[PDB]
Design a protein around this ligand. Structure first.
Ligand SMILES: CC(=O)N[C@@H]1[C@@H](O)[C@H](O[C@@H]2O[C@H](CO)[C@@H](O[C@@H]3O[C@H](CO)[C@@H](O[C@@H]4O[C@H](CO)[C@@H](O)[C@H](O)[C@H]4NC(C)=O)[C@H](O)[C@H]3NC(C)=O)[C@H](O)[C@H]2NC(C)=O)[C@@H](CO)O[C@H]1O
Length: 273
């Protein structure tokens, strides 16, 4: 399989171009568009990388294209752990979809936040706020694929099944890639000497939802999350041998680029994924 990586939440993790030239990642999620819905003007947060004001982040388009020519798919991730993002109604879902289409996808906008590059899709990283209309957002975005270029839909639900916020959206069967987060959740994450909880969770996800491929989402380092970190050796010799048997296995997802560099996680597991 392949490795999906989240980039954008630490200015010291390197440019998007550097990230893709590592040749270790197959998918890159740009985090995050953490503010939107309920009449708010959408705003992206890329930590210390760039300031979106006055097209300060349009420089990212160079990295996007650099990744895409290498066959790497780049998605814009909605939500995250911090933000006042939400959807007040179905009309709000349509408004946000149209916004995303014109500013990040194949639409037209005189003020595209990340430049003129066209992203491959939208990543759903919703973990708080409203639990409604996310399935509508997925439908409206998917409808735009009928105009020619496919709009990929990916999601990053928490491992507890079913996901309180993305459960309904995932039931639509419109998502291509789903990287479940097996951390910050005691009941379905790894615990010293115990892989039962994570394996049991994996079997529930791979047999319950209709998606293209499902990935094992993990923290790239002990400091990347509150809990759930899995030592490389344990992942390789005890977890991967089991989950790779599933026909829906897509690979591994890691949070995040910054911590991956410091811990050298992807470098240690790449060939086994
Ligand atoms: C898929 C998913 O949902 N992943 C979850 C992760 O979101 C979560 O990790 C934490 O994520 C938040 C964002 O949601 C992130 O917060 C960012 O923190 C950085 C560092 O402090 C801030 O960067 C600074 O921004 C200011 C102004 O924007 C700059 O002036 C300054 O230069 C920046 N500093 C640097 C070094 O770049 C970001 O502003 C801030 N983002 C937001 C939206 O406020 C946390 O740091 C993430 N925490 C960790 C440990 O990575 C993860 C937690 O385990 O859980 C996932 O599920």
């Amino acid at each position: 399989g392949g490795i999906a990586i989240y980039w954008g939440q630490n200015g010291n993790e390197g440019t998007l171009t550097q990230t893709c030239s590592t040749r270790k990642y197959s998918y890159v999620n740009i985090a995050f568009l953490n503010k939107f819905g309920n009449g708010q003007t959408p705003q992206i947060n890329l930590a210390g990388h760039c300031n979106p004001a006055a097209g300060g982040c349009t420089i990212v388009s160079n990295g996007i294209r650099s990744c895409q020519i290498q066959g790497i798919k780049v998605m814009l991730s909605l939500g995250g752990g911090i933000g006042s993002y939400t959807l007040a109604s179905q009309a709000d879902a349509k408004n946000v979809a149209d916004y995303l289409w014109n500013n990040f996808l194949g639409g037209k906008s005189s003020s595209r936040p990340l430049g003129d590059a066209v992203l491959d899709g939208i990543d759903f990283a919703i973990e708080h706020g409203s639990t409604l209309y996310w399935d509508d957002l997925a439908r409206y975005l998917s409808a735009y694929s009928k105009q020619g270029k496919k709009v990929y839909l990916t999601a990053a639900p928490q491992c507890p099944f079913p996901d309180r916020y993305l459960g309904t959206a995932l039931n639509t069967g419109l998502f291509d890639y789903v990287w479940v987060q097996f951390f910050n959740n005691p009941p379905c994450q790894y615990s010293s000497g115990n892989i039962n909880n994570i394996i049991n969770s994996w079997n529930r996800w791979t047999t319950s939802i209709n998606a293209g491929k499902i990935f094992l989402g993990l923290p790239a380092a002990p400091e990347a999350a509150g809990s759930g970190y899995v030592p490389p050796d344990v992942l390789i010799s005890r977890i991967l041998p089991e989950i790779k048997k599933s026909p829906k296995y897509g690979g591994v997802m890691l949070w995040s680029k910054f911590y991956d560099d410091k811990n050298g996680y992807s470098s240690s597991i790449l060939d086994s994924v």
